């Protein structure tokens, strides 16, 4: 009786995407420390989910020593930026330029690690059983991308989307292929996730068409 | 020869949704009394429909005493706010703070009552016979949501949609998935009903696709 | 070897719709006489098509005296406003108020006549043979509505669409369900024809879906 | 082992469309010489592809003397404007008005030549084997039109789209039938290619619907 429901690997893919989101977060412009470390808070939240999923990777014991070793390949993902940047500030208090460059290379390594973890999660999700389950899965991906746009922009200045729930607004707008126009990312990676959510609303529409053909052949009954 | 046509339970669902609309209406910002009591007028109009539907619930006689008793559960819905707020003003003339709080709790109870009545109407509509009847039913829901947006915004200030028929305009815009952009709720619950009308235009599109497959298999003939 | 191609009754429906357009034209605000009589020119153009179609109604001879009599019911349609308003100005030079009111009633009668002629043309088009012919017919209706929006707005002031080809632009925008937003009628009957073109682009989309199912069952081959 | 993959004739159609694009480029307003000759650079790039494709037309030898002769009909396409306009400037240094008119007629001839080459490439693409290959082909046409809008506007002033990747942005917007509204050609031939990309996103949607029916009949399995 553990986390193995379809919704489980759903949340798995979700957390992987969110780790990619944190990756995006790490490199950024010069930002306000308050919302910066707020993002850090959300990132530590996600590292908790990292703990959970990588725990489920093993059987909660160390006897899978081989996967433990492969976990070492992907434990850089589990490494938290909240701690990394703080130790960075400590070193700055010490005065270690080359060590700061070393930590930057470490940041890039963690980046690539979380990206590969994303690859893994997306593959396993692609190997899910029920394509009827897509009914939920799509909406799930949708609200996810909503949260993700929120992440990237809610602290981002001059976005005009600084309020929260409006994330859901513009999101469903997109998923519904509206384009009300008063709200849009207007930032490069914002528009990247825009590509994401656009193909997403596409897929949603497609699922709707599939449900249409379903209801057709069934109103035949 | 009574009200039992499919259009009847249609108007039933319609009135239930509109009661939810009035519920929304009750709590609001500080508003102009004129349009406020205009909303009250429309609400009394709807209470007339409440009278009609709850009359049809019984056989116009009191022998269904059990449903009469269950009507007592849902007669708070039939209670009019036009009268409630006026008796509230009377009590204010009297100076009864705690009694005003009591009437506020009464308002919340009426809220929940009308919500449950909505639940009932939506279930019974979900148990309707002809899914071909959806052809009309969708357009009906559409023009309804049009009227509802009108309700929430036509008196609402700075909406830029203060004119009437423009309700129909933005509505069909949505149902047609246009998003002309010059017109949008820009209010929280306005955007909520926006979610509503958006999934609604979605459903409309879906019905259109179903008609497409129909016309396809029939041009095969 | 006369005008009996499907494209013929196509242009028939087209001219009927355009007569309705002229009807719209007649009543209007106080307008610039130049573009006013330019509309009059286009209207006389259409009355030529009225001559053509009502000629085709008979066999170019008067032996169909009964349809000649029924043509008298619908010859008010053939009556030109270019001549009517000019005789109106003549009477104004004479000073005949009540006769001007009489001519206004005459205008209303011509209105209703052209409306019924529209009814006839639309019925006969509804009785067309090939629903494959819809492939063209839809695009035809589309470019028509384009021209019609042009009619109503190109002279209409402050529309921001005073340029010509932009009619085609906003039209295809609609038919493609774009809503670029920089261009919109912003006038009551403009938005009416907007409803028209919106359901039109809907129908276009539907035809596209039908072609989709066609190409599907044929790529099966 | 030569260029004969489906992607090959894909790039063929692509280069033909781009030659049409250069044709558009040639006649234009008075423009900044820097971006002007930048367009010239891209055009010489395309003339290299002209060399490649017309080489593949023969077997890299002159024994197909007949097609060599027909290549003479279409070698004006291979003629570069980068060289033509430069020789034009040389003649201007000489003072040869009538010869400049002659070169203008030559420009028109090259125009028509590249147009016919486009006709040829589009026909041969229409005779492609796999309509499953459309899955890629559509996206390919899409990103092409993206690049093309970029060509026509990125140097074009006051477009508000002077930045590069935003080409991809507005493109996918269109292909996804969004219309975010902050970005649009607002130029005549810009809107022409807009028609192009609009019917293109239409076709994309249609392909998506086909994939929908596919996934439907396969989830039946």
Author numbering:
A (entry chain A), B (entry chain B), C (entry chain D), D (entry chain C): 20 to 240
Provide the authors' own sentences about this structure as they appear in the paper.
KvAP is a Kv channel from the thermophilic archaea Aeropyrum pernix. All voltage sensors have a shared structure consisting of four helical transmembrane segments. The fourth helix, termed S4, contains positive-charged amino acids that move within the transmembrane electrical field as part of a global conformational change. Each subunit encodes a voltage sensor from transmembrane helices S1-S4 and one fourth of the pore from S5 and S6.
The final density map, calculated to 6 Å resolution, showed continuous density for the transmembrane region, density for the Fabs on the extracellular side and a poorly resolved cytoplasmic domain (CTD) on the intracellular side. An important first conclusion is that KvAP is a non-domain-swapped voltage-gated ion channel, meaning each voltage sensor is contiguous with the pore element from the same polypeptide chain. That this must be the case is evident in the short turn connecting S4 to S5 instead of a long α-helical S4-S5 linker. Therefore, KvAP is topologically like Kv10-12 channels and unlike Kv1-7 channels. In contrast, S1 in KvAP runs parallel to and in contact with S5 throughout its length inside the membrane. However, because of the unique interaction between S1 and S5, the S3b-S4 paddle in KvAP resides on the outer-most perimeter of the channel, oriented tangent to the pore domain. In the structure, the helical turn of S3b into S4, the Fab epitope, is exposed to the extracellular surface, compatible with Fab accessibility and a depolarized conformation of KvAP. The voltage sensor is similar in conformation to depolarized voltage sensors in other voltage-gated ion channels. The pore is less open than in the crystal structure of the full-length channel, but more open than in other closed K+ channels. The conformation of the inner helix gate in this structure might reflect a mixture of open and inactivated channels.
